[PDB]
Amino acid sequence: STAKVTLVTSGGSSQDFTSEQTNITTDFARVRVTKGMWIFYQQANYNDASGGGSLWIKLDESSHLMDLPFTPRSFRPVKTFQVGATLYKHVNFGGKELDLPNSNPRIDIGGVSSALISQGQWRLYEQYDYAGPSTRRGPGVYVNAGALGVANDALKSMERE
Ligand SMILES: [Ca+2]
């Protein structure tokens, strides 16, 4: 497995996950990310109903179990950890995601509103196919579009330098 997290219920029962969970029946209370980077959301489907405005938390690898801030209803790995960038439809990493290991000339996820850049330097464009003005962004956490240097819902292509 390339990403892995352990989750524990208030009653003491544990389960490990290695892939995205759009829904989860079990109520988990404590967490330890053992591989990769994960995002947890208060609502199912990665905070889609709230357009990213419900509670969320991004967690990195850890050596110990600790409390979650809320009971997750969905959670997923950031699959471009150590590879590239992931784009998200909603602020705060919510909604439909799109992984960019490399340049993408035509981004179409219903309007990009946040991003996690793990690796690379990139130029971000508000037209397809690297047309028009661009902004440069490297590794970082970008919880809204303004942080990326683009208008909300406007990112259309992203070139890796
Ligand atoms: Ca959006």
Side-chain angles (χ1 to χ4, degrees), residues 37 77 123:
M37 293 185 14
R123 292 200 84 84

Short mmCIF file of all heavy atoms in Angstrom, two decimals, residues 37 77 123:
data_model
loop_
_atom_site.label_atom_id
_atom_site.label_comp_id
_atom_site.label_asym_id
_atom_site.label_seq_id
_atom_site.Cartn_x
_atom_site.Cartn_y
_atom_site.Cartn_z
N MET A 37 -0.58 10.98 3.14
CA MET A 37 -1.27 12.15 3.64
C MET A 37 -2.76 11.93 3.39
O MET A 37 -3.13 11.49 2.30
CB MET A 37 -0.82 13.41 2.93
CG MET A 37 0.60 13.79 3.21
SD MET A 37 1.03 15.52 2.39
CE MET A 37 -0.77 16.04 1.99
N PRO A 77 -6.91 9.56 0.69
CA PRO A 77 -5.50 9.91 0.60
C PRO A 77 -5.29 10.99 -0.46
O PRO A 77 -6.08 11.19 -1.37
CB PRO A 77 -4.85 8.57 0.18
CG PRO A 77 -5.93 7.90 -0.68
CD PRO A 77 -7.21 8.27 -0.01
N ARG A 123 3.06 26.24 -13.48
CA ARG A 123 2.45 27.48 -13.97
C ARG A 123 0.97 27.21 -14.18
O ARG A 123 0.57 26.23 -14.78
CB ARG A 123 3.09 27.94 -15.30
CG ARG A 123 4.51 28.37 -15.15
CD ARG A 123 4.96 29.25 -16.29
NE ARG A 123 4.48 30.59 -15.86
CZ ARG A 123 5.07 31.45 -15.03
NH1 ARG A 123 6.26 31.22 -14.47
NH2 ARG A 123 4.43 32.59 -14.77
#
